[PDB]
Design a binder for this molecule. Structure first.
Ligand SMILES: [Zn+2]
Ligand SMILES: [Zn+2]
Lengths: 47, 47
């Protein structure tokens, strides 16, 4: 959980990619990829 | 991931408990419990 996300988290910061891209990059269920978006205030609160 | 969350998700709807309570209820890392909060618009956008 925290191990894969730590790597995927860096990819998110580099491009703010959507949870779908992160999910496919690490092949993790939407929950793990979507949780990273929830930690990103920029991608979470979008307006 | 989806199996435990499906059960934990119902507990969230019943009391909108914080991710800490859900994490302790199912002993899952903050990511899984915090992701459920992110799906709950009521607990996510709080003001
Ligand atoms: Zn972002
Ligand atoms: Zn809630």
């Amino acid at each position: 959980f925290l191990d894969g996300i730590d790597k995927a988290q860096e990819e998110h910061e580099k491009y703010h990619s959507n949870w779908r891209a992160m999910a496919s990059d690490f092949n993790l269920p939407p929950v793990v990829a979507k949780e990273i978006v929830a930690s990103c205030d920029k991608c979470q609160l979008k307006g």
